[PDB]
Amino acid sequence: LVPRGSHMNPTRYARICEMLARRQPDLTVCMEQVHKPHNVSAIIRTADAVGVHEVHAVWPGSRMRTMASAAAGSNSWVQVKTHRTIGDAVAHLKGQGMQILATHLSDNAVDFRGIDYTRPTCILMGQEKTGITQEALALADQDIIIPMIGMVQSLNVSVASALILYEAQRQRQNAGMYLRENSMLPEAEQQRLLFEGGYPVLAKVAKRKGLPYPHVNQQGEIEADADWWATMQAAG
Amino acid sequence: LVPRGSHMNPTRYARICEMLARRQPDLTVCMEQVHKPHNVSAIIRTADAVGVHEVHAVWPGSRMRTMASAAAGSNSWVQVKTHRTIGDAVAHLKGQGMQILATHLSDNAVDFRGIDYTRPTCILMGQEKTGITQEALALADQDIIIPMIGMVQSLNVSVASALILYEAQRQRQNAGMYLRENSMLPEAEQQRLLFEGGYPVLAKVAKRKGLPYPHVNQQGEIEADADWWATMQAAG
Ligand SMILES: C[S@@+](CC[C@H](N)C(=O)[O-])C[C@H]1O[C@@H](n2cnc3c(N)ncnc32)[C@H](O)[C@@H]1O
Numbered sequence: 156l157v158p159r160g161s162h163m164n165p166t167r168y169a170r171i172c173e174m175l176a177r178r179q180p181d182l183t184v185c186m187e188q189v190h191k192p193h194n195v196s197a198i199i200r201t202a203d204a205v206g207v208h209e210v211h212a213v214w215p216g217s218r219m220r221t222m223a224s225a226a227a228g229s230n231s232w233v234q235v236k237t238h239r240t241i242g243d244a245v246a247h248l249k250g251q252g253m254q255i256l257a258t259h260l261s262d263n264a265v266d267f268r269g270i271d272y273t274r275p276t277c278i279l280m281g282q283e284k285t286g287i288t289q290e291a292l293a294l295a296d297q298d299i300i301i302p303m304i305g306m307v308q309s310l311n312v313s314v315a316s317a318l319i320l321y322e323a324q325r326q327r328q329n330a331g332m333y334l335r336e337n338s339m340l341p342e343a344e345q346q347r348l349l350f351e352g353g354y355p356v357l358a359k360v361a362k363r364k365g366l367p368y369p370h371v372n373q374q375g376e377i378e379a380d381a382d383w384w385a386t387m388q389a390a391g
Numbered sequence: 392l393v394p395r396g397s398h399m400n401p402t403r404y405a406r407i408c409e410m411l412a413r414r415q416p417d418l419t420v421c422m423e424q425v426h427k428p429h430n431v432s433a434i435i436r437t438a439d440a441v442g443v444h445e446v447h448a449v450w451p452g453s454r455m456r457t458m459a460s461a462a463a464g465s466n467s468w469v470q471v472k473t474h475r476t477i478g479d480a481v482a483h484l485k486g487q488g489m490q491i492l493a494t495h496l497s498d499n500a501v502d503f504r505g506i507d508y509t510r511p512t513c514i515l516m517g518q519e520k521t522g523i524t525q526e527a528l529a530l531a532d533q534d535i536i537i538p539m540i541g542m543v544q545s546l547n548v549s550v551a552s553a554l555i556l557y558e559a560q561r562q563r564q565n566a567g568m569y570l571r572e573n574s575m576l577p578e579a580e581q582q583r584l585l586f587e588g589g590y591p592v593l594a595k596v597a598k599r600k601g602l603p604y605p606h607v608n609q610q611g612e613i614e615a616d617a618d619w620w621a622t623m624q625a626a627g
């Protein structure tokens with residue numbers, strides 16, 4: 156039911172299921188070639204902290220994708236969807252009814268707090284030290300800036316990401332959008348995450364053996380057939 | 392009047408003087424043994440961005456003070472006041488009529504957005520990975536937390552500093568507190584900063600030669616007596 160050594164219990168189940176109930180699948184960040192592992196990690200961490208289920212990345216090149224890989228996998232509870240180009244990502248995100256906000260200084264750029272983050276929203280962050288591409292700018296609905304009232308006129312991309320995600324968290328919390336009886340996530344995503352998060356080592360074993368993820372009940376116990384248990388316990 | 396090569400002109404003067412008019416000397420952050428240069432730098436940068444004139448640090452040990460020194464000097468427009476102990480810093484800041492907010496999880500801790508940042512305020516940030524000291528906690532007026540709605544329950548100290556400083560910037564901007572005809576800074580601080588910021592290389596030369604800083608006029612020109620100019624130009 157609950158394998159020895161594993162942390163799962165009725166309480167950790169509750170904590171996980173409450174965390175999924177708070178998940179905001181219509182809110183995301185998209186990293187346009189943001190590739191330094193410390194930035195990718197810090198951005199994912201804030202994404203989790205404001206209830207983002209999935210973040211997006213444009214890592215065109217193989218070295219960029221590989222350097223970023225461990226950081227991309229640093230959080231069991233945030234998946235990273237990779238796109239070849241900003242055209243593909245924005246198409247995909249517009250496809251999900253999301254407004255596309257480009258973190259970018261221009262004459263048309265608006266204070267990031269003037270935005271309604273309670274609607275489906277993608278926050279677009281650009282690279283060190285070059286900013287979002289002209290192509291991305293052409294696809295975005297609106298430029299947003301974080302006002303800087305001193306002499307410096309640039310922030311690190313992790314700090315800028317955190318500030319915009321937490322303005323979304325503020326407005327969503329003020330609108331009560333983290334208080335939910337059920338997750339906005341489909342039941343299948345919730346079971347995937349309960350297992351892949353709750354039993355991260357067993358989820359890898361299941362994948363390698365090409366087995367389905369089993370059901371997890373409110374005790375946090377694994378419910379599966381003798382055949383699943385036997386295959387999962389076989390070498391290796 | 393304006394030495395050759397220097398950036399100062401009537402426009403850079405305006406930008407500097409408008410920046411001093413926006414300065415919020417009753418708002419600060421105090422770093423309790425926050426010593427990693429990347430964190431000290433990133434915290435100072437956000438401090439500048441929300442109008443902080445002076446930040447505070449508790450760096451008890453000589454190696455901590457030295458490792459942090461370049462980061463402490465990374466921004467011409469933010470001074471760092473060092474204190475031997477948290478007792479000395481909090482005494483000094485309570486002395487300036489500031490409420491002391493400890494970034495710290497407890498049963499008594501309040502959402503950081505519930506705070507009135509429009510009043511004199513010190514944000515107290517604690518070290519990696521240990522948090523604010525029990526002694527600091529005993530001196531603080533109130534614990535604040537940044538709510539984290541996912542599984543992770545910790546942010547990097549630079550990201551947490553940025554989020555609380557920008558909640559102060561939000562509330563201060565909403566109250567119009569960055570729109571001022573004159574600086575809240577004394578005239579003497581404004582001239583110090585105009586010269587030390589506007590002419591950072593000459594301010595060091597003035598100090599080494601033990602000369603006073605001269606007057607800077609609205610053209611951004613240096614106004615000083617033949618004697619100052621002669622001493623400043625002498626070897627070396
Ligand atoms: C030029 S990169 C900074 C370098 C990078 N963080 C590093 O570690 O080297 C800054 C990016 O963060 C965001 N950003 C930075 N400063 C900003 C500001 N003042 N307003 C809005 N967005 C900002 C933008 O997406 C921009 O592309």
Ligand SMILES: C[S@@+](CC[C@H](N)C(=O)[O-])C[C@H]1O[C@@H](n2cnc3c(N)ncnc32)[C@H](O)[C@@H]1O
Pocket residue numbers: 427430494495496515516517518519520521522523535536537538539544545546547548549551
């Ligand atoms: C434990 S240190 C993190 C390690 C350090 N940033 C590093 O580079 O290794 C976290 C500090 O940031 C602040 N902080 C972090 N997470 C926070 C949260 N969820 N709520 C409030 N403050 C937080 C507190 O001052 C705390 O002492």
